[PDB]
Write a protein that binds this ligand. Structure first.
Ligand SMILES: [Zn+2]
Ligand SMILES: [Zn+2]
Length: 85
C-alpha cells in the first residue's frame, strides 16, 4: 500500500457573481454604484436577478461581485406592456 496521497480542490465563486441582465426601464431610475440618472431608449442599464440592483452597463464591472446581502427593506415594482395584431 502506502499509495494514494492527493486532494485540494479550489475555484472562484460563481455564486457571488452578479446576475445583472440588460433591460429597459419605464421610469427615471438612478444608478446604484455611481448614482446618476439612467437614460437611454434600449439597454439603458442593468438589473440583477437576486439583488435587483440597477447599475450602468459600464458600472457593472466596477460593482463588487459581492452579491446576496440581506441588509435591505426597500423593494420596487415591475410593470408590463401589451400589444395587438
Ligand atoms: Zn446582484
Ligand atoms: Zn453608474
Amino acid at each position: 500500500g502506502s499509495s494514494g496521497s492527493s486532494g485540494g480542490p479550489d475555484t472562484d465563486d460563481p455564486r457571488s457573481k452578479h446576475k445583472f441582465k440588460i433591460h429597459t426601464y419605464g421610469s427615471p431610475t438612478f444608478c446604484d454604484h455611481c448614482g446618476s440618472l439612467l437614460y437611454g431608449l434600449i439597454h439603458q442599464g442593468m438589473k440583477c436577478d437576486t439583488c435587483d440592483m440597477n447599475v450602468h452597463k459600464q458600472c457593472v464591472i466596477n460593482v463588487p461581485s459581492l452579491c446576496g446581502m440581506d441588509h435591505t427593506e426597500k423593494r420596487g415594482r415591475i410593470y408590463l406592456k401589451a400589444e395587438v395584431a
